[PDB]
Amino acid sequence: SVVTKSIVNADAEARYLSPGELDRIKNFVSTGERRLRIAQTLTENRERIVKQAGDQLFQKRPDVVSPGGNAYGEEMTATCLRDLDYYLRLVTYGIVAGDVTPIEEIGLVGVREMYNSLGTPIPAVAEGIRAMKNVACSLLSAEDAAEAGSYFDFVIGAMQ
Amino acid sequence: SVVTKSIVNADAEARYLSPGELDRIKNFVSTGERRLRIAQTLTENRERIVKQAGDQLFQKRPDVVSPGGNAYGEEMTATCLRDLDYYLRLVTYGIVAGDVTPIEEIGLVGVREMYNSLGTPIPAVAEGIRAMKNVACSLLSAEDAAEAGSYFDFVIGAMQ
Amino acid sequence: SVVTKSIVNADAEARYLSPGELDRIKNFVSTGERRLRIAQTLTENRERIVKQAGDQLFQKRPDVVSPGGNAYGEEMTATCLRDLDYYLRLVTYGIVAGDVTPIEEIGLVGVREMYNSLGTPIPAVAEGIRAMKNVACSLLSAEDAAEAGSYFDFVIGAMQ
Amino acid sequence: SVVTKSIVNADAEARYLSPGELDRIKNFVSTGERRLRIAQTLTENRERIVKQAGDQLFQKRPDVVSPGGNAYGEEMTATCLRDLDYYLRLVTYGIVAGDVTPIEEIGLVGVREMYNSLGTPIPAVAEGIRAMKNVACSLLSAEDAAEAGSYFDFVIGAMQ
Amino acid sequence: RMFKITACVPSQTRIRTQRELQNTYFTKLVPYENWFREQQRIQKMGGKIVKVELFTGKPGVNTGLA
Amino acid sequence: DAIVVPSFAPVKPRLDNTKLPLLSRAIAEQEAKARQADPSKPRFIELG
Amino acid sequence: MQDAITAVINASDVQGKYLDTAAMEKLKAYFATGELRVRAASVISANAANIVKEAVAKSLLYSDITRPGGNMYTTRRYAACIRDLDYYLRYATYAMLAGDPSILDERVLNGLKETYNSLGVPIAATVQAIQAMKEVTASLVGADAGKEMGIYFDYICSGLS
Amino acid sequence: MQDAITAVINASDVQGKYLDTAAMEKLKAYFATGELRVRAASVISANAANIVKEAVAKSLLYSDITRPGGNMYTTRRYAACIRDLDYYLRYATYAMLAGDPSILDERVLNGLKETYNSLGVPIAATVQAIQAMKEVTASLVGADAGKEMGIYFDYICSGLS
Amino acid sequence: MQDAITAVINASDVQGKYLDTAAMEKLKAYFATGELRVRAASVISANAANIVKEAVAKSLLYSDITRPGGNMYTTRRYAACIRDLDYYLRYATYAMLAGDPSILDERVLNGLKETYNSLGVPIAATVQAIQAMKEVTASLVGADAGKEMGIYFDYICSGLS
Amino acid sequence: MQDAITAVINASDVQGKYLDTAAMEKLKAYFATGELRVRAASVISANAANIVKEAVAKSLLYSDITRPGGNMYTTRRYAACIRDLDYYLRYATYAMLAGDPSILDERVLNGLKETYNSLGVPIAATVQAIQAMKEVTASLVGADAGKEMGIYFDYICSGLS
Amino acid sequence: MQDAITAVINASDVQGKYLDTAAMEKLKAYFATGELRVRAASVISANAANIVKEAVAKSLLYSDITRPGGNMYTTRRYAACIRDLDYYLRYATYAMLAGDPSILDERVLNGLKETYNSLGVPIAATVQAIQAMKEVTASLVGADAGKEMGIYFDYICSGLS
């Protein structure tokens, strides 16, 4: 959260929050209702966002669901869809937080190491999250969808 | 300034400006006109603030203007009044800029070193600036007084 | 000013200011504060005063603003209001001055020739000033109305 | 003259007169009528220009005609007016020529040396010629006065 | 007045292929002057401060400090 | 005995802002619109 | 190193569940209180030195601990004591702005008890002194903000105790 | 001619705006000065002839200017010199009360230097006499009145020279 | 580091005057333009990689510079070259957001000349590359914002040359 | 770093001869002057801040330099200026105690003019300020110790110039 | 050296374009103001020495600088000071005639600050002196031309700073 970052900066310089930093947290406080609304529609439509995006991902690169792909078979495909749901709710946490610190901590540091240990292709993960972003944008208003899209963009960049 | 502070932090992080930081810059841009008007009324009432607040300070702290005090003698008292004018000037800059960066750079950094060499008690300087804050509050509306009061608060806190 | 009128008379007389003339100057000095307060009231209520006066004047002589009239149409009606506002500002100047000297040099010398050239009706202009006098009496204190009414009355007589 | 100065520059760079230089030569010759007319006015009023301007100089600088001064006595003052007469003559020559090289050739090369040898104050001579210029303004129409004024300007500027 | 300290430094910033146990868990002798500055740095890093002892010096001494 | 990094010298920028393209457009607009007629006001012919 | 929002989302993450309406209710409450918190922080910062002076005068001064052989006797120890109280106040206002006690545990109370007992600093006296700070701060910030200031002051008292 | 109030009114008319706060305080400064002005004017009229006599005695009397061939060495010339000095004094007293130099510019200082020059009367001698009259007038009027009278008389002397 | 606002107030500070009406007009102009700046920064931040890619392809590729012994040959040097181009674009957009070139001179161009001369980097090739960046980024942000990015890119070019 | 004794013995050491009688005489002279050197150092150690304050007031205050835009203006710059004066006075007392100017050349005057030129500090004004310091310190320590302090203060001035 | 016309055509030449309509605008504006420039140049050519005389008297005389030890003291240095003022005024009239400040930068302000610092000349005092020149020359040429002279006198001041 931006509140956390402001406290960290002031603590580093051993100063009480400057008036500008205090104004920053004031602005974020007022923005909170809008951010909560965006996260609320995401969680309300979590099932729909995950499902059609997953089908689009498998259609995009069918080698994943083909034999020899990491997600070959119903159980493997189910767990990958579970991962897509995981990342969506990570993005919801980031949206309410206002910064990407929660997303990074929960599911980014060592992203390549985790999924290559599993044998999963990280570019394919990127396409899956891209599909989630498109479906999420449809369920968001255009003004709101800019805010959520930024967190999605950070996540796909980190996937790569 | 908001722009210079955001760009400093982004430069250290080696990132193009974050979307949230750009949003803060947008809001600062829109509120700039209110900031300019607040600074305008302060500079218009420069004379009244200085003389009224200075007389309040001397009442609160008769020791400084007493013989054996730092400001005793019309000339010394006048130069202290000039210092109060200087600090009001820095506060007007800070109100326009949106951060303390100009205030602290121009003055209020080596403040203890300078004033120790000069012989003045820096808490007494802080009392004078507090009196200026009170007069400026009277000259401002409740909303406007809150914005200007924060910069005055930073100055007095740094003096202490 | 009243002092200016006395100075002109003294210059023609080739004599120092008369003791009684200086006495009237002293009276003008005493009444400077009261005259300034009355002028401030007029300036404060300027828009409403001439707005009501314009409605009253157009009601009294509907042919000023009717088709074929001098001020027929919105733009010319606004210009008529400006001419009334010019007169109102001159009356405020004259109230501050304490003498007819300010008005006579502006709007009371050759005004008949100018209005005849443009085509506007001089009698209707005079009625408009009278409507202003009534509005000012409503918006001012009783003795303030008497003095302001006197200056207004000189303007009305000049229009005749 | 303009013709001789143009020829001199063309001589230095070893070029036949450029078409623009030829135009300037033609123009100066044609407007020679106006030039002669201005010079005729000045020579017609040589007496009053020198006399009035010299009296203005004496009044502006009483020290020059004071006892123990350069101009004390009617004999010395006669010589002083003679010098002003010489400079007016040079100015008329310069107007006729259309260039200041006749004026410089005759009476501005070494004026400091000559006048310091005589004891005369060089700034005072400059102020006398300024007086001649001011007298010239009334005698010459505004358009004409600007033309003669420039030659007077060169004389005073070299004098100082 | 050297302080003997025992502390942890877990780091989420990166995953380290090279040895990290040495930095992670350690005991060090920090002088009295340094201890506040180091305490703030390690506390900021978020590591748990397991143990503190006054290895050198005495618990309270008005003058004659090391 | 020389100091390779004696101190970092401040520099006075050569290119003066408020001549830069964006501010110059804005300065033109604020000036010209101020001289022009003002929306939402009763008296506009009086002002010089 | 957490605030109210971080705590809410982290608790939901520990459960593994998505954001719930009750969790969003907690977030809404913090946002509603946010502006109140901010102005309190500004007041605390400006008067921080005076808060410490008044609280020390009302708690520690003219007593045996400042008298010789009392652990705050000698200029060096007095300076350290007032500095530590300054730091307590600054970290307290950090925690108040965050709306969480995580900063207090992570950056203040960790190792603080161990160090204080190692040097034999009187922990009871410090707790009393920061209680004095608490009432001075309550007066300055107001009753509303004072209650929030009180819980974090008491949290620090608990850690020392 | 103009006054302090009239000049502010002229400036406001040029601007085209009703009385401002700045206009109010400029006018109020004239209103406050009025008491000093009128008292000084009465004193100036009472001692006007004595002021002229004192000034010429201090500056030009018992000098070569009074001695034969000095532009004041005739009964007629001496009377004319006293007359012109009285003219300057009267217009200056007017202008001091008015508060503006427009009266002096319009009447007192119009072509005066050129006429004096052509006659041969010394501009410097007149300027010295005017300064002497200013000193006498300041003494008679008082300190605050002398400062204002100095400004007006300074305009006349500077315009003459 | 400076901003347009910071530069204006610093100039007024050097003179020692509170912000004049002319200074206020400059500040108001910058505020009016701030939204346009924010938009342009949002655009090129998203397309930063594409801008570098196009500029490199247009000017730096399929030439001797990126073939054996060319200073861009070797993967280490190719990575360094594209990193420098992102450096230039990032600081250029910082300067565009600020409305002041002080950022570029203080950071980007302090001894950049000297480093490139030492390294053997061709100054002319870098200038060509950032010229290509200028063309691409101007097209992306539009004409009015492009002429603002253009001046900062050309300032970097002049510093290099 | 050297002093009078170290310089004498080093000069003999280069020859490789034992201390001859002339070298002993130089050492005796330093020992004779050492007592007054010690007294002077103790005196200006007591008045260090006061000496700086007096010199700053004498030449550096109520002047354009401390007025806005003058280089002693700005609180940081004022602190830096008085810090430099503290530096100069302390090194002057070091050199006076040692009896050799080697400390000044080694630790003060090397690369000092270049840094001041880069910073924009006026070398002339610094020289004036330390001249004022020289006056004050000479008065405090006495005349003969004042001669000794003066040579090293002049040494510093020459290095700056 | 450049002028307004030369600058316009040089900029168009750099961009390889025939004169634009905007370039034609700038050329027309210079031609419209050109005759005013010529008249002003004639005026201050005649009064160059007088302008320097007044400005020297109005800020540089009867001051600590011209008293002993103030740099302007000594007849040499006085002659150098007035000569520099004549330099500044002459180059200001060159710049005003040209309609471009390139002359000032190319022939006056290049190295001038460096030389003044080495000489010990007060850059602040020279700036004050040329501002006094600015006032005097504005009075002589008139308001319109005085504005034009000012934008080049201020340019010289900024270079000196």
Ligand SMILES: *[C@H](C)[C@H]1/C(=C/c2[nH]c(/C=C3N=C(/C=C4\NC(=O)C(CC)=C4C)C(C)=C\3CCC(=O)O)c(CCC(=O)O)c2C)NC(=O)[C@@H]1C
């Ligand atoms: C996997 C089988 C289990 C598991 C592991 C887990 N370990 C850590 C953190 C650390 N592990 C070590 C151990 C070593 N460091 C070394 O250098 C070597 C080689 C000599 C070893 C064996 C250390 C020092 C740490 C801490 C510092 C660090 O991050 O490296 C974690 C992270 C704990 C945390 O949250 O900070 C985890 C999760 N976890 C499991 O569930 C398995 C049973």
Ligand SMILES: *[C@H](C)[C@H]1/C(=C/c2[nH]c(/C=C3N=C(/C=C4\NC(=O)C(CC)=C4C)C(C)=C\3CCC(=O)O)c(CCC(=O)O)c2C)NC(=O)[C@@H]1C
């Ligand atoms: C006296 C010359 C100046 C002055 C002093 C003053 N001091 C206090 C209160 C306290 N002073 C101390 C000082 C010390 N404690 C130490 O351990 C040591 C070194 C061994 C010192 C010097 C302390 C601890 C206190 C407060 C508690 C106590 O008494 O122990 C006061 C009272 C404060 C007040 O105004 O309320 C004063 C006035 N006052 C002067 O005017 C002198 C310049």
Ligand SMILES: *[C@H](C)[C@H]1/C(=C/c2[nH]c(/C=C3N=C(/C=C4\NC(=O)C(CC)=C4C)C(C)=C\3CCC(=O)O)c(CCC(=O)O)c2C)NC(=O)[C@@H]1C
């Ligand atoms: C004041 C209320 C009481 C008191 C205090 C006292 N404390 C110390 C020494 C230390 N205190 C700390 C604690 C902290 N360090 C930190 O960085 C932070 C912020 C998170 C805290 C709270 C530490 C590390 C030390 C030791 C090193 C140091 O001095 O900084 C002393 C000094 C003891 C000594 O000098 O021997 C004192 C006196 N003393 C009292 O009497 C009060 C009851």
Ligand SMILES: *[C@H](C)[C@H]1/C(=C/c2[nH]c(/C=C3N=C(/C=C4\NC(=O)C(CC)=C4C)C(C)=C\3CCC(=O)O)c(CCC(=O)O)c2C)NC(=O)[C@@H]1C
């Ligand atoms: C081939 C197996 C794959 C592939 C590659 C591809 N590469 C390029 C262009 C370039 N490649 C390099 C590579 C190097 N530069 C070096 O210094 C070194 C180390 C010695 C290497 C390996 C460079 C510099 C370029 C840039 C162009 C140039 O050299 O001037 C292309 C062309 C890209 C384009 O569209 O311009 C391609 C296609 N492509 C494949 O499909 C293979 C999987």
Ligand SMILES: *[C@H](C)[C@H]1/C(=C/c2[nH]c(/C=C3N=C(/C=C4\NC(=O)C(CC)=C4C)C(C)=C\3CCC(=O)O)c(CCC(=O)O)c2C)NC(=O)[C@@H]1C
């Ligand atoms: C003021 C309310 C109190 C006070 C002050 C006092 N100050 C001085 C002298 C100086 N003050 C300054 C201050 C500044 N310089 C800066 O650049 C800035 C930031 C823009 C500041 C605030 C300086 C430079 C001086 C030195 C003199 C000078 O300006 O040249 C004095 C005079 C000291 C003396 O005796 O000589 C005084 C008295 N005095 C009080 O009583 C107040 C509590």
Ligand SMILES: *[C@H](C)[C@H]1/C(=C/c2[nH]c(/C=C3N=C(/C=C4\NC(=O)C(CC)=C4C)C(C)=C\3CCC(=O)O)c(CCC(=O)O)c2C)NC(=O)[C@@H]1C
């Ligand atoms: C005071 C008499 C004049 C003055 C001084 C001023 N100096 C600086 C900055 C620096 N001065 C030094 C010099 C020294 N460093 C040393 O270690 C020693 C002793 C061994 C000396 C003599 C240095 C290194 C600096 C720069 C680093 C720093 O800030 O300390 C400044 C600051 C300039 C700036 O803006 O950064 C100033 C103002 N100023 C005056 O007006 C006096 C004439």
Ligand SMILES: *[C@H](C)[C@H]1/C(=C/c2[nH]c(/C=C3N=C(/C=C4\NC(=O)C(CC)=C4C)C(C)=C\3CCC(=O)O)c(CCC(=O)O)c2C)NC(=O)[C@@H]1C
């Ligand atoms: C003297 C016998 C004659 C005379 C002189 C006069 N001089 C001035 C003004 C100045 N004179 C100087 C002279 C010097 N400055 C130097 O550095 C040196 C060498 C050490 C000298 C000789 C200066 C600098 C001035 C300017 C004023 C100042 O010092 O600040 C005046 C005043 C001029 C004025 O109107 O301002 C006068 C009158 N006057 C005579 O009648 C004598 C014949």
Ligand SMILES: *[C@H](C)[C@H]1/C(=C/c2[nH]c(/C=C3N=C(/C=C4\NC(=O)C(CC)=C4C)C(C)=C\3CCC(=O)O)c(CCC(=O)O)c2C)NC(=O)[C@@H]1C
């Ligand atoms: C007068 C306002 C101030 C002043 C001046 C002063 N200047 C110098 C010396 C020099 N000035 C220059 C400057 C120029 N040279 C140029 O060619 C031009 C125009 C292109 C300029 C502006 C130079 C080169 C010198 C040094 C060489 C020389 O002597 O001419 C001095 C002399 C310093 C000395 O002692 O050697 C002085 C005194 N002095 C003041 O007090 C004023 C504030």
Ligand SMILES: CCC1=C(C)/C(=C/C2=NC(=C\c3[nH]c(/C=C4\NC(=O)[C@H](C)[C@H]4CC)c(C)c3CCC(=O)O)/C(CCC(=O)O)=C2C)NC1=O
């Ligand atoms: C060419 C024509 C002409 C005349 C006549 C003339 C007279 C003249 N008489 C003067 C003085 C004077 N004149 C008198 C005259 C008199 N007092 C008496 O008791 C007597 C009754 C009487 C003469 C018999 C006195 C007393 C003064 C001096 C006044 C003073 O300063 O107190 C003065 C002023 C002092 C001076 O000279 O500077 C002048 C100018 N000036 C002229 O230009």
Ligand SMILES: CCC1=C(C)/C(=C/C2=NC(=C\c3[nH]c(/C=C4\NC(=O)[C@H](C)[C@H]4CC)c(C)c3CCC(=O)O)/C(CCC(=O)O)=C2C)NC1=O
């Ligand atoms: C705009 C107002 C105004 C002015 C200024 C004015 C001046 C004026 N002064 C004049 C003469 C004169 N003025 C003086 C005055 C003086 N003698 C001295 O010794 C002194 C230096 C000096 C003044 C104290 C003298 C002596 C004459 C000539 C008198 C004569 O010989 O006929 C004349 C010529 C007619 C005459 O002789 O009176 C005029 C017109 N007239 C005006 O209407």
